[PDB]
């Protein structure tokens, strides 16, 4: 009568039942109109007696655990307008008799276990507005031609299904359709030109299919188009110039296709464009200056293409740009200082180009720039002192250039700087003490430079994890202060001029996985405390030095060490201390003064006879 969830007619008969989110279990009045049992965690099949309520205009079974078929009897309900079966375990085909529900408007099948094809019957439903069957992995076959007959369709989505083949030319008859969502599916073949007949189309999402052919020109005649996602297909040919005729277009994603040709000039006419992703294609030509007319661009990603020429200075007119990725192209010329006029830039990646000249200091005045990636170019000149103005810098990669001069002290003003790679450059001088001021610094890669001078523990921040100073001119002694970095994981000092002993303070680096001291002037005796780091796992490289004395007994403790190179030293005595490392994989003992017999165990038998031949007395004794 009046209780909670019940509604009645004017003649006094129960007309409605609504139950939402009550936490139940299990399975489940001929005047009924609306029936909602939803979010009740119900189970079992849908009883086929549902087809007995003839006045039902709404059936919502959504957000349950229901299983089995969608009973054919459900389609006996001739007055049904909404059918909501989504978010269940429902299996089987969508029955042909679905074409019988003459006045269906809403049809929600999404997120189920459904299979088979979509019935040619859907064409009969001429009041159908919304069809969403997506998220059924096994829904297969071609979208039927008859879909063209549902002329009230405003929304179609079939996403994450096995729907395949090519979209039918019939689609051009849906003159009211607004969103088409069929993505992460099996679609192949070309987008039909007839799609340009969908005059109300706003959102077209075809991404992650096998779609082939070229983007049809006809798409330019769609005046209501806002978002176009065609990323990750097989698309071929040139970007249609006519795309620049859709005034309302704010998002274009063509990434990861086979596109060629040029970025079209007509794009300047798109006054609403906020996001352009062309990443991973074959696009040639230069970035057209008219693109700088797109006042609203936040995201520009043109990376992994064939683009040539210079980055235009009129870039300064994009005052909303937060993201610029051109990496892996043929770009040449200077990086324009005018790029510093886009004050919102969060991320710049120009890596893998031919850019040359100085890095303009103005770019370091950006207060929001978190990522600056210029690696692998022809850049040169100094790192500007202005680097310290760039307050939010997080990840900085300058590596693989010609940069000269010394690392400016003002880098120490950057408190958010996490990761810095300046490797492969011409940098000179000392590592500046002020870098101690980068309190967030985790990764530091200076390798393959002309750096020199000494090395102080006071010079480095204790939050360091990865250090690579290799292939430089560094000298004097490894500072005892090295013991203060307790977080240090990989440490690579190789191919330098370093000398003296290994300071025993090394033992207090409790996290150290990798230590490369190779190709230096280190001398004396490998300290016992070097055994004292059980975290040493990945590799320990002491080779090409002047070390003497024996392998300290404590090396029996490094039970995790996979790779050990002591080669090319003056080391003496035998290998017995090593016989017990079962995790030792690679051992290079060659070019030393070792003598004595190795056991015949398979590991020592593995060692190349030529490695034994460069020592004093080493041989395999048979037990």
């Amino acid at each position: 009568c009046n209780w909670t969830g019940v509604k009645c007619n004017r003649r006094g008969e129960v007309s409605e039942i609504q139950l939402k989110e009550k936490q139940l279990q299990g399975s489940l009045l001929k005047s009924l109109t609306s029936l909602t049992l939803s979010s009740l965690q119900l189970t079992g099949v849908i009883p086929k007696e549902i087809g007995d309520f003839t006045e039902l205009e709404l059936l919502d079974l959504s957000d349950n655990s229901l299983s089995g078929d969608i009973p054919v009897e459900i389609f006996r309900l001739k007055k049904l307008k909404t059918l909501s079966l989504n978010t269940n375990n429902l299996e089987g085909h969508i029955p042909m008799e679905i074409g019988n529900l003459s006045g269906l408007v809403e049809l929600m099948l999404f997120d189920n276990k459904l299979s088979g094809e979509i019935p040619r019957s859907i064409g009969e439903l001429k009041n159908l507005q919304v069809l969403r069957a997506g998220g059924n992995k096994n829904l297969r076959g071609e979208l039927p031609w008859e879909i063209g007959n549902c002329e009230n369709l405003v929304m179609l989505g079939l996403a994450e299904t096995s729907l395949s083949g090519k979209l039918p030319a019939s689609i051009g008859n849906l003159k009211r359709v607004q969103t088409i969502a069929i993505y992460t599916s099996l679609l192949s073949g070309p987008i039909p030109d007839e799609i340009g007949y969908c005059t109300e189309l706003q959102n077209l999402y075809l991404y992650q299919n096998s779609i082939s052919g070229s983007i049809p020109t006809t798409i330019g005649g769609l005046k209501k188009l806002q978002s176009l996602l065609l990323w990750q297909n097989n698309l071929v040919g040139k970007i249609p110039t006519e795309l620049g005729n859709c005034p309302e277009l704010w998002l274009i994603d063509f990434s990861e296709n086979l596109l060629t040709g040029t970025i079209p000039r007509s794009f300047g006419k798109l006054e609403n464009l906020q996001e352009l992703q062309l990443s991973v294609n074959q696009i040639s030509g230069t970035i057209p200056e008219e693109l700088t007319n797109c006042t609203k661009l936040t995201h520009l990603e043109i990376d992994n293409n064939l683009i040539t020429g210079e980055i235009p200075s009129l870039m300064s007119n994009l005052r909303s740009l937060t993201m610029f990725f051109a990496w892996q192209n043929k770009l040449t010329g200077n990086i324009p200082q005018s790029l510093s006029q886009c004050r919102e830039l969060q991320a710049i990646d120009l890596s893998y180009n031919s850019l040359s000249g100085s890095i303009p200091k103005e770019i370091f005045g950006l207060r929001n720039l978190t990522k600056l990636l210029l690696l692998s170019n022809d850049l040169s000149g100094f790192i500007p002192p202005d680097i310290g103005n760039c307050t939010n810098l997080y990840r900085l990669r300058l590596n693989g250039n010609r940069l000269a001069g010394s690392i400016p002290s003002e880098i120490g003003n950057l408190k958010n700087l996490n990761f810095v790679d300046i490797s492969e450059n011409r940098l000179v001088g000392s590592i500046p003490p002020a870098i101690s001021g980068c309190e967030s610094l985790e990764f530091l890669d200076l390798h393959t430079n002309s750096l020199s001078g000494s090395l102080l523990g006071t010079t480095l921040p204790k939050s360091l994890k990865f250090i690579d100073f290799s292939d430089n001119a560094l000298s004097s002694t490894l500072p005892p202060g090295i013991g203060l970095l307790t977080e240090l994981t990989k440490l690579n000092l190789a191919k330098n001029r370093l000398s003296g002993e290994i300071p025993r303070e090394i033992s207090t680096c409790r996290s150290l996985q990798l230590l490369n001291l190779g190709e230096n002037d280190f001398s004396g005796e490998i300290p016992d405390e070097l055994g004292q780091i059980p975290s040493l796992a990945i590799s320990l490289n002491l080779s090409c030095n002047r070390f003497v004395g024996e392998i300290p007994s404590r090396f029996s403790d490094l039970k995790n060490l996979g790779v050990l190179d002591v080669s090319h030293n003056q080391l003496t005595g035998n290998l017995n201390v090593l016989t017990d490392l079962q995790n030792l994989v690679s051992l290079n003992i060659s070019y030393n003064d070792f003598s004595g017999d190795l056991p015949n165990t398979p590991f020592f038998r593995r060692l190349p006879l030529s490695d034994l031949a460069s020592n004093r007395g080493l041989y395999i004794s048979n037990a």
Partner: peptide, 13 residues
């Protein structure tokens, strides 16, 4: 549940 519409994820170095 199937994923909502997304753009191509951006990749940086």
């Amino acid at each position: 549940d199937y994923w909502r519409a997304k753009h191509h994820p951006p990749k940086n170095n």
